[PDB]
Amino acid sequence: GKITFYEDRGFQGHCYECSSDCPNLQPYFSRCNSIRVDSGCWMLYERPNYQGHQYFLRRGDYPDYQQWMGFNDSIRSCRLIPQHTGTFRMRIYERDDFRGQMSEITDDCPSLQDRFHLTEVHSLNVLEGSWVLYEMPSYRGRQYLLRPGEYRRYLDWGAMNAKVGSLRRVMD
């Protein structure tokens, strides 16, 4: 994977090229207002150690932080997300701790409301692949990376509530 962070918009100003996970990008650049992703699927984070607002980016040119639905120009850590192939799989649950009705998801879902008549998911188990959870339908709003593993409360994927609008498999 290869990604380049620019301090100013339109690919101007001080910049930095990265090809791995980095828990603290502050030793390399101070702000980010545009990005070129050459390869790889990336999750970017507002704060060091993969904290704060999260943003999903794939190959392409991003001339302003609005293009990754950014809240501000802070990008202070990043993950190169492993690219799974074959079947992605997760289980979503109505209640905490894998309780309530369970639904299995093995493809993209642009509206959990349309598919399941749900507005909230309170726990989920990612069995195969990485995913991005979105606050709003059609892959909009706040974003949360779901790596394989157990998420017994919505707090575990970094959200401040259980609202889930859409879900996307991490694929290039």
Description:
InterPro entries: Beta/Gamma-Crystallin, Beta/gamma_crystallin, G_crystallin-like. Crystallins are the dominant structural components of the vertebrate eye lens. This is Gamma-crystallin B. Strands 2-1-3-6 form a four-stranded antiparallel β-sheet, with no helix packed on it. It has a four-stranded antiparallel β-sheet with strand order 9-8-10-13, with no helix packed on it. The longest helix has 5 residues. The protein contains one helix and 14 strands. It has two domains: 83 residues, Gamma-B Crystallin, domain 1; 89 residues, Crystallins (Gamma-B Crystallin, domain 1). The relative contact order is 0.17. The radius of gyration is 16 Å and the shape is elongated. It is mostly beta strands and 172 residues long.
State the helical fraction: under 10%
For the record, what CATH class of the largest domain applies? Mainly Beta
Give the structural class. Answer: mainly beta
Adjacency order of strands in the biggest sheet:
2-1-3-6
Q: Do you know the CATH architecture of the largest domain?
A: Sandwich
Percent of residues in β-strands: over 45%
Q: Please report the total strand number as a whole number.
A: 14
In this structure, how is the largest beta sheet organized?
Answer: 4 strands, antiparallel
CATH topology of the largest domain: Gamma-B Crystallin, domain 1
Number of helices: 1
Give me the Rg, rounded.
Answer: 16 Å
Shape summary: elongated
Q: Gap between N and C termini, in Å?
A: 11 Å
Which series of helices and strands comes N to C? EEEEEEEEEHEEEEE
Looking at CATH, the homologous superfamily of the largest domain is: Crystallins
Task: State the domain count.
Answer: 2
PDB class: structural protein
Keywords: Eye lens protein, structural protein
Assembly: monomeric
Entry title: Crystal structure of Gamma-B Crystallin expressed in E. coli based on mRNA variant 2
